Amino acid sequence: ATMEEVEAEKSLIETNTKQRMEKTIETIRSNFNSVRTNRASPTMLDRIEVEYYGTPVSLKSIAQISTPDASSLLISPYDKSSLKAIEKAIVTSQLGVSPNNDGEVIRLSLPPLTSDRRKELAKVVSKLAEEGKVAVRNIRRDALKSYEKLEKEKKLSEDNVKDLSADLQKLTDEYMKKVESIYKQKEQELM
Amino acid sequence: SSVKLILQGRNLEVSDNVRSHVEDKVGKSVAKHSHLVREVDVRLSARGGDLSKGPKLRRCEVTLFTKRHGVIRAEEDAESLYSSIDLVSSIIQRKLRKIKDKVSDH
RNA sequence: AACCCGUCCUCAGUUCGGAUUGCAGGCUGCAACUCGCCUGCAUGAAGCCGGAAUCGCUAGUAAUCGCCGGUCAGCCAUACGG
RNA sequence: UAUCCCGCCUGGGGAGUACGUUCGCAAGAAUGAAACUCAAAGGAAUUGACGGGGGCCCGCACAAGCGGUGGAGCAUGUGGUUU
RNA sequence: CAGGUAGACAGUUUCUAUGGGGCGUAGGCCUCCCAAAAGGUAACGGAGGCGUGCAAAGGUUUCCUCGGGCCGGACGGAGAUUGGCCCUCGAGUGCAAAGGCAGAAGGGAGCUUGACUGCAAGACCCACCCGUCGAGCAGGGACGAAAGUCGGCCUUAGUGAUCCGACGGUGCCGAGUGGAAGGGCCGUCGCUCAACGGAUAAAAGUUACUCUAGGGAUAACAGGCUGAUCUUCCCCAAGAGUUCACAUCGACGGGAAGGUUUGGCACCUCGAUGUCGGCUCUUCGCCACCUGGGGCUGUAGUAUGUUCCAAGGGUUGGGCUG
RNA sequence: UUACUGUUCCCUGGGAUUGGCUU
RNA sequence: GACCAGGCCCGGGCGACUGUUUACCAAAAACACAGGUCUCCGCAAAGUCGUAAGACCAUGUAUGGGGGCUGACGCCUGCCCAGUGCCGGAAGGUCAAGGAAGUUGGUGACCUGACAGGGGAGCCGGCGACCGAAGCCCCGGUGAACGGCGGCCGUAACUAUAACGGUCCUAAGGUAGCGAAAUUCCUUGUCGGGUAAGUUCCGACCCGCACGAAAGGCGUAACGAUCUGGGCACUGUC
RNA sequence: GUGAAACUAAGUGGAGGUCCGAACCGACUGAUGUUGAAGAAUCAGCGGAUGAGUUGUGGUUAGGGGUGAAAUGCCACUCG
Ligand SMILES: [Mg+2]
Ligand SMILES: [Mg+2]
Ligand SMILES: [Mg+2]
Ligand SMILES: [Mg+2]
Ligand SMILES: [Mg+2]
Ligand SMILES: [Mg+2]
Ligand SMILES: [Mg+2]
Ligand SMILES: [Mg+2]
Ligand SMILES: [Mg+2]
Ligand SMILES: [Mg+2]
Ligand SMILES: [Mg+2]
Ligand SMILES: [Mg+2]
Ligand SMILES: [Mg+2]
Ligand SMILES: [Mg+2]
Ligand SMILES: [Mg+2]
Ligand SMILES: [Mg+2]
Ligand SMILES: [Mg+2]
Ligand SMILES: [Mg+2]
Ligand SMILES: [Mg+2]
Ligand SMILES: [Mg+2]
Ligand SMILES: [Mg+2]
Ligand SMILES: [Mg+2]
Ligand SMILES: [Mg+2]
Ligand SMILES: [Mg+2]
Ligand SMILES: [Mg+2]
Ligand SMILES: [Mg+2]
Ligand SMILES: [Mg+2]
Ligand SMILES: [Mg+2]
Ligand SMILES: [Mg+2]
Ligand SMILES: [Mg+2]
Ligand SMILES: [Mg+2]
Ligand SMILES: [Mg+2]
Ligand SMILES: [Mg+2]
Ligand SMILES: [Mg+2]
Ligand SMILES: [Mg+2]
Ligand SMILES: [Mg+2]
Ligand SMILES: [Mg+2]
Ligand SMILES: [Mg+2]
Ligand SMILES: [Mg+2]
Ligand SMILES: [Mg+2]
Ligand SMILES: [Mg+2]
Ligand SMILES: [Mg+2]
Ligand SMILES: [Mg+2]
Ligand SMILES: [Mg+2]
Ligand SMILES: [Mg+2]
Ligand SMILES: [Mg+2]
Ligand SMILES: [Mg+2]
Ligand SMILES: [Mg+2]
Ligand SMILES: [Mg+2]
Ligand SMILES: [Mg+2]
Ligand SMILES: [Mg+2]
Ligand SMILES: [Mg+2]
Ligand SMILES: [Mg+2]
Ligand SMILES: [Mg+2]
Ligand SMILES: [Mg+2]
Ligand SMILES: [Mg+2]
Ligand SMILES: [Mg+2]
Ligand SMILES: [Mg+2]
């Protein structure tokens, strides 16, 4: 178990972690944005498509999305024939909003935050954080096995594993703090 | 795999998201008997609504010529474009499976 | 016209094959560059009967040879109808 | 055609399901709902269509024969791209 | 009698170095540095290599010079091969490195086997055993016209004592004598005996059921040294702060004290310095949580914020956890 | 204990105990 | 009315239970247990103790005896025989002592040469064609025998998951049931319940570091000077 | 009660590795003692107590061993 072997076995296993930790933190942030806590919605209306002369086309190409207020939204359709198609898609999408019409445009109104919704919604926010922590702990759980597999194969010493393992926890614990930090700023958004 | 494809904008323009949806469906139904066929013919159409009088309806005509004197004719009509593509692909997978059951009758 | 008689070419990308391009000319037409048809020369590609597949034909038919006409000033007709 | 007695049905799905009860070593049997939901479900028979059902017959339908296409070059049409 | 066959049973082995031991790594030889201008010189100090190869890459005689850059020339281009010019040892010398070598120790050609036999004055090295160079003499020879050169390779790693055995040779001995068996002698061969001065022809683990002889020469607790780390301050002020570096934070970096953290060293204690937390009972320190008294404020007031003097006194009861 | 060298139980062959007629 | 003379209830883990155990720090979840299963033994039995004679087993006879594992009862007890074991097989290959077709050497009655060469008989030796068992190799069976029971990618119409599929490697890749457990490192996992507040306790989820089917799995009334949490009553524990 | 049985109500009977609890055999908790009264006991409660029970007398098994409801426990205060 020369030093050149410890560096290589450290470099191989460690890069699989860091390259895997960044995948989790990237996807975990996407799980928060999918909760859609009625802050602002230039993004919600993007995935809804509509039919325009036998062509499924996104709403972004057919009309403009302007946010005059955080709790509302304005759609300026260039074609009046395409206005009704937008109303159909929003309702069939079942997002949870009742669109209105003023004869020219479509206006949305995100509802207010209720107490019953905030608690049921807060349970989802905590649940996603739990799914993030277990994702990290599985990576700590996978990395330490490989150090033990090298040990049983007599390519590392007992002394090397205790050093790498103790040094590997410091790496993961840094990424753990990123989980709470994203959770702290989110819990402030509930109010 | 290793099979060509032919689309046709009969009464409209063929988009890219649509073309991806076409390859996804027939790619499933044809991947099974992929070593029997060489090409895939497709013809999309649209009618009604704002274009013509009557209910909006979009046709998807799909023809297939295998490597051994096989001919398939499939035509369906639906209210949307993707729904029309879905129903036709189910018909091809039905008749395409009917052929192997006759060849593998023994 | 295929065909008959006679000379030459003897299995070669060849006296097979005639694409591509340059030069020099003619006819139609007010007009021929994009965008017509032809002549005279010189260049002389690919191509050695052709995968998986697939078409026509049961008698003067298939195969093969050439002729005519319509539209048309002219003609991209190797088409169409005989 | 008639009399006497027993059991059994009252649209379909949910469902012979759930709770509870009796029996059974168990597997399970018997008894047996409701919420919600559709305007049908179903029977006989006819007519066509269809059948890797049966029987018969026909067309260059296959088979057999002759010559081609698909390859090469060049006419000429369609798509596609481009404008 | 022989072959095979159960740790059922017996007798034993199971290396050392080591900033405690173990897991790891290493064990012999050569080269450079550390090595302090002779030589020699340690560390778990920094870099790399060897366990050979060549029948010519040996010996002798003899003729040559590589490499780089530019220019010219078909395929040919940065680069094959060819001509010329310029700088001159920048190449190469089977392999690591150092040192050395230019009409050469490098690169070719011709003949050859001295990659001999029997020696050897005198030296270098040095605990011992080993190891290294070598004028010169005889013999019989190679190359060269001759003088002269040659006892393997430009040099330094390419290796293993002794016992025993094996092959070949031999004018030696031959257990009464003659022979023979066998042995000696000469020439040479056979170990990754690599833990490489090799304990045997032949050997791994476990003990928390344990035991003895010893050690503070040697670990864990504590003390002490050190102060990386930790804690607490200071220096510079790029900026934040509506403008305004210093009301309050202060990056980038720098200079300190303290000895409560985790550690390094292993100096006291191994014919004993009994541990974590808690109960009870103290007592000091200030780098100040509250109480007393002040300054500044982006201090209106109340209430803070930061900081100075100040350690007199005070600093609760419970749930979970050893 | 699949550490080294051995012992024992056990299995197997030759010999003794051990002989006759046939194939 | 003194002395004498049960505290009780709800829930969970382990073991079925009565019992046995480290005399002098461990009474238990360990041991035993009824039962269940595998394998051996046809009596001059296997097995066990002995140098042997012989003894026990047994004055018994496969509904009996010995040995291994498991441990009432109830529902069940899966996959892999490549390897290691055990059983059986017998074609060939390897093969001891021993036997002996022969071959070879030493000695020398003699012969010859010029001290040496050759050499009969007899004696003493060496080598060994071929014959030569079991065992092993080899061919099958056997898991309530020792034992083991995998990874990497992609895919569902919002994300997220992956019913499904592809690939590599093994003898085979963990089936029922259970699951932060007497097993879970991260860990005081997370949600719920209980408490004014619960690193312990109960229920559930499953990311099972490293459950798992007779070294048995999941449950289980009763029992326990067993471990573990809560509550009523009681009290100088406080 | 039935065709006869199965099944079923009383009485008799007094079973159990049954219950409470002395002797007897054990030794779970705590206190005390810990140069003890005692080289394991005293005090207060505790377990089994018709059974796989306890006990006397007289005997058997002896160390590369014996014995062991198996702790490496016991074999004359001594047992890897
Ligand atoms: Mg050609
Ligand atoms: Mg030809
Ligand atoms: Mg052709
Ligand atoms: Mg006809
Ligand atoms: Mg009918
Ligand atoms: Mg035909
Ligand atoms: Mg032993
Ligand atoms: Mg042995
Ligand atoms: Mg001894
Ligand atoms: Mg040592
Ligand atoms: Mg000096
Ligand atoms: Mg020196
Ligand atoms: Mg040089
Ligand atoms: Mg030279
Ligand atoms: Mg003699
Ligand atoms: Mg000599
Ligand atoms: Mg040595
Ligand atoms: Mg223990
Ligand atoms: Mg023990
Ligand atoms: Mg000391
Ligand atoms: Mg310490
Ligand atoms: Mg210390
Ligand atoms: Mg101190
Ligand atoms: Mg210290
Ligand atoms: Mg003393
Ligand atoms: Mg002060
Ligand atoms: Mg009492
Ligand atoms: Mg627990
Ligand atoms: Mg018990
Ligand atoms: Mg008991
Ligand atoms: Mg005791
Ligand atoms: Mg007890
Ligand atoms: Mg006790
Ligand atoms: Mg016990
Ligand atoms: Mg016997
Ligand atoms: Mg057990
Ligand atoms: Mg086997
Ligand atoms: Mg087998
Ligand atoms: Mg399962
Ligand atoms: Mg927990
Ligand atoms: Mg576990
Ligand atoms: Mg508690
Ligand atoms: Mg639990
Ligand atoms: Mg287990
Ligand atoms: Mg099993
Ligand atoms: Mg098992
Ligand atoms: Mg069990
Ligand atoms: Mg108990
Ligand atoms: Mg009793
Ligand atoms: Mg009692
Ligand atoms: Mg006792
Ligand atoms: Mg008492
Ligand atoms: Mg009592
Ligand atoms: Mg009692
Ligand atoms: Mg009792
Ligand atoms: Mg005695
Ligand atoms: Mg003795
Ligand atoms: Mg004793």
PDB file of N, CA, C and O (backbone and C1' of nucleotides) in Angstrom, chain E residues 80-102:
ATOM      1  P     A E  80      13.093  14.034 -44.332  1.00  0.00           P
ATOM      2  O5'   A E  80      12.651  12.511 -44.186  1.00  0.00           O
ATOM      3  C5'   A E  80      13.038  11.755 -43.045  1.00  0.00           C
ATOM      4  C4'   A E  80      13.375  10.329 -43.403  1.00  0.00           C
ATOM      5  C3'   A E  80      14.388  10.165 -44.534  1.00  0.00           C
ATOM      6  O3'   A E  80      15.235   9.050 -44.270  1.00  0.00           O
ATOM      7  C1'   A E  80      12.366   9.088 -45.118  1.00  0.00           C
ATOM      8  P     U E  81      16.823   9.262 -44.166  1.00  0.00           P
ATOM      9  O5'   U E  81      17.308   9.222 -45.679  1.00  0.00           O
ATOM     10  C5'   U E  81      17.315   8.002 -46.401  1.00  0.00           C
ATOM     11  C4'   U E  81      17.355   8.233 -47.890  1.00  0.00           C
ATOM     12  C3'   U E  81      18.374   9.243 -48.385  1.00  0.00           C
ATOM     13  O3'   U E  81      19.690   8.727 -48.434  1.00  0.00           O
ATOM     14  C1'   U E  81      16.308   9.621 -49.460  1.00  0.00           C
ATOM     15  P     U E  82      20.935   9.671 -48.070  1.00  0.00           P
ATOM     16  O5'   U E  82      21.028  10.663 -49.308  1.00  0.00           O
ATOM     17  C5'   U E  82      21.190  10.164 -50.626  1.00  0.00           C
ATOM     18  C4'   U E  82      21.162  11.276 -51.643  1.00  0.00           C
ATOM     19  C3'   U E  82      22.039  12.478 -51.330  1.00  0.00           C
ATOM     20  O3'   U E  82      23.398  12.279 -51.673  1.00  0.00           O
ATOM     21  C1'   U E  82      19.890  13.226 -51.938  1.00  0.00           C
ATOM     22  P     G E  83      24.552  13.032 -50.848  1.00  0.00           P
ATOM     23  O5'   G E  83      24.543  14.505 -51.448  1.00  0.00           O
ATOM     24  C5'   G E  83      24.846  14.725 -52.817  1.00  0.00           C
ATOM     25  C4'   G E  83      24.808  16.189 -53.172  1.00  0.00           C
ATOM     26  C3'   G E  83      25.501  17.134 -52.205  1.00  0.00           C
ATOM     27  O3'   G E  83      26.907  17.168 -52.362  1.00  0.00           O
ATOM     28  C1'   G E  83      23.382  18.002 -52.758  1.00  0.00           C
ATOM     29  P     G E  84      27.847  17.459 -51.093  1.00  0.00           P
ATOM     30  O5'   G E  84      27.646  19.013 -50.817  1.00  0.00           O
ATOM     31  C5'   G E  84      27.983  19.966 -51.812  1.00  0.00           C
ATOM     32  C4'   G E  84      27.438  21.335 -51.493  1.00  0.00           C
ATOM     33  C3'   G E  84      27.838  21.931 -50.153  1.00  0.00           C
ATOM     34  O3'   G E  84      29.139  22.490 -50.156  1.00  0.00           O
ATOM     35  C1'   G E  84      25.521  22.224 -50.480  1.00  0.00           C
ATOM     36  P     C E  85      29.942  22.658 -48.775  1.00  0.00           P
ATOM     37  O5'   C E  85      29.206  23.868 -48.046  1.00  0.00           O
ATOM     38  C5'   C E  85      29.248  25.174 -48.598  1.00  0.00           C
ATOM     39  C4'   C E  85      28.347  26.129 -47.856  1.00  0.00           C
ATOM     40  C3'   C E  85      28.635  26.317 -46.377  1.00  0.00           C
ATOM     41  O3'   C E  85      29.721  27.190 -46.127  1.00  0.00           O
ATOM     42  C1'   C E  85      26.314  26.024 -46.692  1.00  0.00           C
ATOM     43  P     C E  86      30.717  26.905 -44.898  1.00  0.00           P
ATOM     44  O5'   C E  86      29.894  27.382 -43.619  1.00  0.00           O
ATOM     45  C5'   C E  86      29.529  28.743 -43.462  1.00  0.00           C
ATOM     46  C4'   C E  86      28.493  28.927 -42.381  1.00  0.00           C
ATOM     47  C3'   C E  86      28.882  28.459 -40.989  1.00  0.00           C
ATOM     48  O3'   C E  86      29.706  29.383 -40.299  1.00  0.00           O
ATOM     49  C1'   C E  86      26.711  27.686 -41.496  1.00  0.00           C
ATOM     50  P     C E  87      30.856  28.854 -39.310  1.00  0.00           P
ATOM     51  O5'   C E  87      30.060  28.366 -38.019  1.00  0.00           O
ATOM     52  C5'   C E  87      29.443  29.305 -37.152  1.00  0.00           C
ATOM     53  C4'   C E  87      28.762  28.634 -35.986  1.00  0.00           C
ATOM     54  C3'   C E  87      29.597  27.636 -35.199  1.00  0.00           C
ATOM     55  O3'   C E  87      30.476  28.253 -34.276  1.00  0.00           O
ATOM     56  C1'   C E  87      27.464  26.715 -35.630  1.00  0.00           C
ATOM     57  P     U E  88      31.975  27.703 -34.095  1.00  0.00           P
ATOM     58  O5'   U E  88      31.782  26.232 -33.515  1.00  0.00           O
ATOM     59  C5'   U E  88      31.075  26.014 -32.298  1.00  0.00           C
ATOM     60  C4'   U E  88      30.778  24.551 -32.074  1.00  0.00           C
ATOM     61  C3'   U E  88      31.978  23.697 -31.669  1.00  0.00           C
ATOM     62  O3'   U E  88      31.564  22.673 -30.769  1.00  0.00           O
ATOM     63  C1'   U E  88      31.074  22.875 -33.689  1.00  0.00           C
ATOM     64  P     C E  89      32.042  22.705 -29.237  1.00  0.00           P
ATOM     65  O5'   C E  89      31.527  21.319 -28.647  1.00  0.00           O
ATOM     66  C5'   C E  89      30.136  21.076 -28.467  1.00  0.00           C
ATOM     67  C4'   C E  89      29.813  19.606 -28.547  1.00  0.00           C
ATOM     68  C3'   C E  89      30.570  18.720 -27.557  1.00  0.00           C
ATOM     69  O3'   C E  89      29.745  17.631 -27.150  1.00  0.00           O
ATOM     70  C1'   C E  89      31.053  18.028 -29.755  1.00  0.00           C
ATOM     71  P     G E  90      28.752  17.790 -25.896  1.00  0.00           P
ATOM     72  O5'   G E  90      27.449  18.456 -26.520  1.00  0.00           O
ATOM     73  C5'   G E  90      26.346  18.797 -25.695  1.00  0.00           C
ATOM     74  C4'   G E  90      25.293  19.559 -26.457  1.00  0.00           C
ATOM     75  C3'   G E  90      24.454  18.747 -27.430  1.00  0.00           C
ATOM     76  O3'   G E  90      23.397  18.058 -26.786  1.00  0.00           O
ATOM     77  C1'   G E  90      25.131  20.801 -28.432  1.00  0.00           C
ATOM     78  P     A E  91      23.502  16.478 -26.517  1.00  0.00           P
ATOM     79  O5'   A E  91      22.859  15.824 -27.818  1.00  0.00           O
ATOM     80  C5'   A E  91      22.653  14.423 -27.899  1.00  0.00           C
ATOM     81  C4'   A E  91      22.931  13.906 -29.286  1.00  0.00           C
ATOM     82  C3'   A E  91      23.085  12.400 -29.417  1.00  0.00           C
ATOM     83  O3'   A E  91      21.844  11.721 -29.496  1.00  0.00           O
ATOM     84  C1'   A E  91      24.860  13.470 -30.546  1.00  0.00           C
ATOM     85  P     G E  92      21.483  10.569 -28.436  1.00  0.00           P
ATOM     86  O5'   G E  92      22.610   9.467 -28.660  1.00  0.00           O
ATOM     87  C5'   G E  92      22.740   8.803 -29.908  1.00  0.00           C
ATOM     88  C4'   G E  92      24.097   8.162 -30.053  1.00  0.00           C
ATOM     89  C3'   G E  92      24.462   7.127 -29.001  1.00  0.00           C
ATOM     90  O3'   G E  92      23.921   5.846 -29.272  1.00  0.00           O
ATOM     91  C1'   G E  92      26.251   8.642 -29.261  1.00  0.00           C
ATOM     92  P     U E  93      23.565   4.849 -28.064  1.00  0.00           P
ATOM     93  O5'   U E  93      24.986   4.441 -27.469  1.00  0.00           O
ATOM     94  C5'   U E  93      25.918   3.712 -28.251  1.00  0.00           C
ATOM     95  C4'   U E  93      27.271   3.643 -27.589  1.00  0.00           C
ATOM     96  C3'   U E  93      27.308   3.017 -26.204  1.00  0.00           C
ATOM     97  O3'   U E  93      27.344   1.601 -26.248  1.00  0.00           O
ATOM     98  C1'   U E  93      28.554   5.032 -26.204  1.00  0.00           C
ATOM     99  P     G E  94      26.919   0.736 -24.963  1.00  0.00           P
ATOM    100  O5'   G E  94      25.330   0.711 -25.027  1.00  0.00           O
ATOM    101  C5'   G E  94      24.653   0.618 -26.271  1.00  0.00           C
ATOM    102  C4'   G E  94      23.400  -0.216 -26.167  1.00  0.00           C
ATOM    103  C3'   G E  94      22.565  -0.021 -24.910  1.00  0.00           C
ATOM    104  O3'   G E  94      21.721   1.113 -24.983  1.00  0.00           O
ATOM    105  C1'   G E  94      22.854  -2.332 -25.319  1.00  0.00           C
ATOM    106  P     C E  95      21.740   2.214 -23.813  1.00  0.00           P
ATOM    107  O5'   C E  95      20.875   1.551 -22.652  1.00  0.00           O
ATOM    108  C5'   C E  95      19.554   1.089 -22.907  1.00  0.00           C
ATOM    109  C4'   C E  95      18.915   0.511 -21.670  1.00  0.00           C
ATOM    110  C3'   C E  95      18.856   1.453 -20.469  1.00  0.00           C
ATOM    111  O3'   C E  95      17.663   1.225 -19.722  1.00  0.00           O
ATOM    112  C1'   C E  95      20.105  -0.472 -19.903  1.00  0.00           C
ATOM    113  P     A E  96      16.890   2.465 -19.054  1.00  0.00           P
ATOM    114  O5'   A E  96      17.765   2.816 -17.770  1.00  0.00           O
ATOM    115  C5'   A E  96      18.320   4.112 -17.596  1.00  0.00           C
ATOM    116  C4'   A E  96      18.426   4.475 -16.137  1.00  0.00           C
ATOM    117  C3'   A E  96      19.375   5.613 -15.800  1.00  0.00           C
ATOM    118  O3'   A E  96      18.794   6.889 -16.010  1.00  0.00           O
ATOM    119  C1'   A E  96      19.733   3.807 -14.312  1.00  0.00           C
ATOM    120  P     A E  97      19.566   8.007 -16.866  1.00  0.00           P
ATOM    121  O5'   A E  97      20.558   8.678 -15.818  1.00  0.00           O
ATOM    122  C5'   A E  97      20.064   9.267 -14.625  1.00  0.00           C
ATOM    123  C4'   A E  97      21.102   9.255 -13.534  1.00  0.00           C
ATOM    124  C3'   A E  97      22.438   9.894 -13.878  1.00  0.00           C
ATOM    125  O3'   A E  97      22.430  11.306 -13.756  1.00  0.00           O
ATOM    126  C1'   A E  97      22.819   7.787 -12.904  1.00  0.00           C
ATOM    127  P     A E  98      23.344  12.204 -14.724  1.00  0.00           P
ATOM    128  O5'   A E  98      24.795  12.111 -14.078  1.00  0.00           O
ATOM    129  C5'   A E  98      25.043  12.648 -12.789  1.00  0.00           C
ATOM    130  C4'   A E  98      26.316  12.107 -12.191  1.00  0.00           C
ATOM    131  C3'   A E  98      27.594  12.390 -12.961  1.00  0.00           C
ATOM    132  O3'   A E  98      28.100  13.695 -12.745  1.00  0.00           O
ATOM    133  C1'   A E  98      27.547  10.119 -12.338  1.00  0.00           C
ATOM    134  P     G E  99      28.812  14.489 -13.946  1.00  0.00           P
ATOM    135  O5'   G E  99      30.185  13.712 -14.164  1.00  0.00           O
ATOM    136  C5'   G E  99      31.217  13.785 -13.193  1.00  0.00           C
ATOM    137  C4'   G E  99      32.298  12.764 -13.442  1.00  0.00           C
ATOM    138  C3'   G E  99      32.996  12.833 -14.789  1.00  0.00           C
ATOM    139  O3'   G E  99      33.985  13.844 -14.870  1.00  0.00           O
ATOM    140  C1'   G E  99      32.416  10.601 -14.335  1.00  0.00           C
ATOM    141  P     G E 100      34.249  14.589 -16.269  1.00  0.00           P
ATOM    142  O5'   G E 100      34.827  13.446 -17.217  1.00  0.00           O
ATOM    143  C5'   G E 100      36.131  12.928 -17.006  1.00  0.00           C
ATOM    144  C4'   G E 100      36.401  11.707 -17.850  1.00  0.00           C
ATOM    145  C3'   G E 100      36.488  11.923 -19.352  1.00  0.00           C
ATOM    146  O3'   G E 100      37.743  12.428 -19.771  1.00  0.00           O
ATOM    147  C1'   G E 100      35.131  10.045 -18.906  1.00  0.00           C
ATOM    148  P     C E 101      37.834  13.433 -21.019  1.00  0.00           P
ATOM    149  O5'   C E 101      37.545  12.513 -22.286  1.00  0.00           O
ATOM    150  C5'   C E 101      38.511  11.574 -22.732  1.00  0.00           C
ATOM    151  C4'   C E 101      37.951  10.648 -23.782  1.00  0.00           C
ATOM    152  C3'   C E 101      37.556  11.288 -25.103  1.00  0.00           C
ATOM    153  O3'   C E 101      38.661  11.475 -25.975  1.00  0.00           O
ATOM    154  C1'   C E 101      35.833   9.837 -24.368  1.00  0.00           C
ATOM    155  P     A E 102      39.208  12.947 -26.331  1.00  0.00           P
ATOM    156  O5'   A E 102      39.013  13.061 -27.909  1.00  0.00           O
ATOM    157  C5'   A E 102      37.714  12.993 -28.484  1.00  0.00           C
ATOM    158  C4'   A E 102      37.731  13.198 -29.980  1.00  0.00           C
ATOM    159  C3'   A E 102      38.108  14.602 -30.442  1.00  0.00           C
ATOM    160  O3'   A E 102      38.733  14.543 -31.726  1.00  0.00           O
ATOM    161  C1'   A E 102      35.895  14.134 -31.103  1.00  0.00           C
TER     162        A E 102
END
